Design a protein around this ligand. Sequence first.
Ligand SMILES: O=C(O)CCCC(=O)Nc1ccc(CC[N+]2([O-])CCCCC2)cc1
Lengths: 217, 212
Amino acid sequence: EVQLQQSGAELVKPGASVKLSCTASGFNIKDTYMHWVKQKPEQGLEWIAQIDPANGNTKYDPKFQGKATITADTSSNTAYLHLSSLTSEDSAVYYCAADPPYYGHGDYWGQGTTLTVSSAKTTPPSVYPLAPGSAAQTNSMVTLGCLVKGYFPEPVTVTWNSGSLSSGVHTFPAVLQSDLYTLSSSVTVPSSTWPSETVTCNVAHPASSTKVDKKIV
Amino acid sequence: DIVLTQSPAIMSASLGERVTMTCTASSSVSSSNLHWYQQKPGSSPKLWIYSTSNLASGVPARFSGSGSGTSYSLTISSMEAEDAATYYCHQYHRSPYTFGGGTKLEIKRADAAPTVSIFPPSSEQLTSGGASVVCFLNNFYPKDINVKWKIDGSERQNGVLNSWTDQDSKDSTYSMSSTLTLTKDEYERHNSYTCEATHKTSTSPIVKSFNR
Ligand SMILES: O=C(O)CCCC(=O)Nc1ccc(CC[N+]2([O-])CCCCC2)cc1
């Protein structure tokens, strides 16, 4: 397949810099134009810069001047994006794109490289169970939950009963509160079989190599 | 700097319904340089329509594009579930190249009242000196909803964190989670904790609370 392969996810402290890469297979980048596009968390698309690898000529959106540097290496068939003096405003998914390299087909976009700029330290989440308090008068089904709080960085993996419970589950997008993330997950199961058949919330935080099993009681 | 404005920002369509969205440019652009991309959560934008009216590889015949100068549109003859996504128009006419703000297309379904559940802090959390009260408002439609936190007759604004899920792939509903966090002390200081949800499916609010 023709495709653009980008380097892995980046987690960088503010004030630092980072160089992202994008390698083409199936065509030579010197035969087209390479671009980098930024998409801020939950936002639209912003063109950053363009480069013609055959001569190195570049174009930049004025607002990234002094921040972004695009370069390319035709021998490795790779385009690069350098970002300096990183700030939280730089946190975003960065895509490299190539104008259509062949007639009859469209353009190509890499899978994206997530860049997170934060000074926060790696922190494992505090996993708290959410069990019904009041007498609970919800006849056929019951909703339980889990609160995954104060962790960094993303992501955390949440499953119920080790992946066996997958229907009626709602794992909400994490929210940032003071450099640290917090998320919650709810699961609804027949009340006839709870708490007889235990419901456990399994939270995994890769970055801190933690895995907690909080049983709802 | 050729600004692209998309209308509407968000829009719902029942299955089978005809859909039209527009893209307007601050300055005229060649129709050969105006494109549309489709994006779904978690994946890269994908070329949908190139040069105003041509469908990209694999794009369904139900889609179409029209326009020139400063006015363009994308139309879907008949709405299908997998059409739900964000569509961005893009001008590759003059630098800086720009994208419109996007049109998020959602699926219209029958209204549905939220299933509300309130949860008290955990003893584990209380032992660490914190107290988060959580409220889930699940599977409702439409997405518009307001949640109020009340502690002992006082609306609590600060310290609330809300999170919404993407439209459900199975039932086209939305879900919300709201969390009110206080210190362990503030929490033991009050006894009535209420989560109030106002949704168009009902005049009176849905109320869920607990004591102590
Ligand atoms: O699909 C076909 O059958 C014919 C392909 C024609 C075609 O897709 N042309 C086309 C499509 C998209 C673009 C935009 C390319 N671009 O690299 C996208 C990222 C931002 C900068 C510009 C430019 C030209």
